[PDB]
Design a protein around this ligand. Sequence first.
Ligand SMILES: Cc1ccc(CC(=O)NC[C@@H]2CCCO2)cc1
Length: 460
Amino acid sequence: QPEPDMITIFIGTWNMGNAPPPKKITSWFLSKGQGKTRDDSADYIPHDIYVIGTQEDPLSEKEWLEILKHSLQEITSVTFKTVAIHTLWNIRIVVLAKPEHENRISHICTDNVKTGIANTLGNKGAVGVSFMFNGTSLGFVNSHLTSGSEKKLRRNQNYMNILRFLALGDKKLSPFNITHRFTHLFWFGDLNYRVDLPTWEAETIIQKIKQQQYADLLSHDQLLTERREQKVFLHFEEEEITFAPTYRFERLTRDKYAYTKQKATGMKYNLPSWCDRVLWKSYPLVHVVCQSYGSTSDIMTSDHSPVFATFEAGVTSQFVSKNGPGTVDSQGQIEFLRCYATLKTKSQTKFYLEFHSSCLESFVKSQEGENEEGSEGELVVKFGETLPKLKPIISDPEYLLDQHILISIKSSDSDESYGEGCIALRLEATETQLPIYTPLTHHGELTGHFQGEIKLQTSQ
Ligand SMILES: Cc1ccc(CC(=O)NC[C@@H]2CCCO2)cc1
């Protein structure tokens, strides 16, 4: 029975509005409704992994698991296995997988982050799950960010706290946050970004939604505009939105948006918005294709509609050779030529690199680089031909060309990372000097760049 090189992943996000779900929620898991929807011919084909994020979830874990499993069994005639479930307040993540994957899944981690301080600590934050699927690391984050049209900067701060403090994946990757720890990272939830148009325009917005004309609304969506200005979700992807705003509906129909200020809303307007979103970030040159992104039309217990997204994702096998794991394969090596880091820092410490990868027995520290002043004020750290030769555990090109090297640039004075990035080994050639590049981030914000050349030697 061969190991897969692709799987499909279902991502769901639903703010349930503290109400129990209706009897039938299968449309969610079938990717049926508005937007980029799934073909009817696929309805019986189970996804490999289902990741369900809820917010304002009033159910017990047991109650929700029974609904989810019975839903999937009705669609697919498969009894899914529970990989993980984690709840913070009313924010919940459930991971289900096909039974045939039970012995492919390992290193399961869960964690949560509470956002805010005092007043603003007690219901917003995030839950997450990570695991290995054979040779591939997967991370999943469900966040419920701060509400209200005038709080986009708070949402952006919530995002930065969650990616700094959520403790998922390989703890040995100590310089790296969740935005670098996984082959594929999916981040979804009630992100709560709004369509920033004047309150007076509410009926105009409703008109536009009825005409399925979303362009003038999406051009004011706070998540798209903040992402374009590099304020949040740097280096994440989102599929184009082709479904109506998923908030704020009158319950028990989808015919009416309830936007007017009420005591129940703290006298705030809730103009129709795309609160409910799915984004992802995968390592460079790994296959990931979004195959659906949309909302349901027939699940009306909440003031939000459920959102679905599905993905094809490349996966790799748990590789064994005669040599590694448990030794190196002298027939493999990774060399770096003419490398330099460009950093936005004002500081003047020396810097060194760390190279982390599951193709190495352990991480590798470089010598300190040579600081020069760049022509436009920047710090340039030169490594020249000084970087250590990396010794992979396995030399087979079928394994090595699928790997990635994480890079941290660290201060010699504090050993703190000033920037993190990732290089793919999926090269156009072996035994050939080829340009490499990554942006560098710290706490998910841009801090610099790393560029140079690589020379990869495989057994072929
Ligand atoms: C209109 C707009 C443009 C950019 C972004 C951020 C982003 O990461 N987009 C993914 C790629 C990256 C290169 C351009 O598109 C959001 C919204």
